[PDB]
Amino acid sequence: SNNSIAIPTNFTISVTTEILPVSMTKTSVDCTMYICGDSTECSNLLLQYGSFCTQLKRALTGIAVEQDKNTQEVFAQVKQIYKTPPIKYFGGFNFSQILPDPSKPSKRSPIEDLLFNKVTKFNGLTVLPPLLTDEMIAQYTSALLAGTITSGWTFGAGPALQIPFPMQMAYRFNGIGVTQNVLYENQKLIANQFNSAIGKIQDSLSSTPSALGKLQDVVNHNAQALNTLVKQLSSKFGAISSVLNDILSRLDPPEAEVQIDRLITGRLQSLQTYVTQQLIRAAEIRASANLAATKMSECVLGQSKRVDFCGKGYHLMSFPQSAPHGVVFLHVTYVPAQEKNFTTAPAICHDGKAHFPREGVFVSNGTHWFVTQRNFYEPQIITTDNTFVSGNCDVVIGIVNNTVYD
């Protein structure tokens, strides 16, 4: 209706989980071992065939360096390693579920342990280990968490400037359009809601395995591609036998040439198809890793005004967690709740002058008019302190009569 507004009278601190792939398995192939094994005459014929081996090796090496660069871009945002103070008091906020656990030798958070537990040949195929270990990625995550908890967004824009956590969350509220008095009044309730949400996150991740489905999908696709290649190594492609030793121990050279040609053509086609599919999957992984890096910069290292970019609702914070071949973002957002109906007017007519709120809306309880902030119901007496005149009464449409106290 053209007279009614709905103003929230309460809020919920919600933590949502976003899982993003970052890197995939680095695989290298030897063209000679895959196509020909140790057959010297097969190797000579392949040399006479062309120069596809170097191109395929270049593509795979590019993919490997690509994956290492993706992990570096996502997790190496900081330049210093930050440590949380030994006394873990942050105004009633409990980060034990998020912070690393000293007892476990891996020095991983309980959520990170849950993620690592949930999401968990020799024909020329090799798997190269990533440049950064799981412990190193965990240390990047711990440094990011410590910096966010102890200094807010300052460590991403320069030197880390220490700040008490309630004041940091007050400034985040001021960022989302709520005065800091709301947090300073409801600190215990907000801390309790945050603790409950963080505790519920672990159970939510454990209950639904589909949450970590993207990382497992990446692993499964890589495994399926490798298995398909190994199986294609047992095809005939028109040759009498699929074994080079058999074709060499049964036939004279000149007539074995045609069968070995057929095997070489088939295996080259299979390996090229594998390389092309790997390139496309690597493009997808770059897209996801760039998205993850942007979220780490914008959700974790600062407060984002972009809608639905960092969780659902008005974004307050974001916490990273390392997962096998990916990242998990715990987005902490402010969801208004317990809405109430009110009667609203664009302006207040007093002394022949129109009055507009400097910040907030005009709210009537039926009998009296107050001024409130938009996202929370804190009625206040309409005064010249929180109003500006800038106009006349007759021009504005929908103006109402009332007194503005001095």
Binding site: D68, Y82, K83, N123, L128, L131, L132, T150, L233
Partner: protein, 118 residues
């Protein structure tokens, strides 16, 4: 089972064979194969090179070191940690360091320690 002689894996490759003369089962494993990576600085800097045998136990192939990436020869492991110069493997990087101008391998340092007074 007493009637079959060959064994095969999910890859359709011969994994086990029953010996004809004496009836026992023998597991066939392909003897160590791997890749070789040459770790070098610029040729102008020096001609010293290190060799990383990838995924090979360093027995099958300041002199030798066992990395989770493979066996590295020609690099001396140092317990000091520096910033990564050229990647080698799972957290180990190599560099051309004078400190004794030679190639050294080390666990990479993620960054300078900083404890903010909260």
């Amino acid at each position: 089972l007493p009637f079959q002689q060959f064994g095969r894996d999910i890859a359709d490759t011969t994994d086990a064979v029953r010996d004809p003369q004496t009836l026992e089962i023998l597991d066939i494993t392909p003897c160590s194969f791997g890749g070789v990576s040459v770790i070098t600085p610029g040729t102008n800097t020096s001609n010293q090179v290190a060799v990383l045998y990838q995924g090979v136990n360093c027995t099958e192939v300041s002199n030798v070191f066992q990395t989770r990436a493979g066996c590295l020869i020609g690099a001396e492991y140092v317990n000091n940690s520096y910033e990564c110069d050229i990647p080698i493997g799972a957290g180990i990087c190599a560099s051309y360091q004078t400190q004794s101008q030679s190639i050294i391998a080390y666990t990479m340092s993620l960054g300078a320690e900083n404890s903010v007074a909260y």
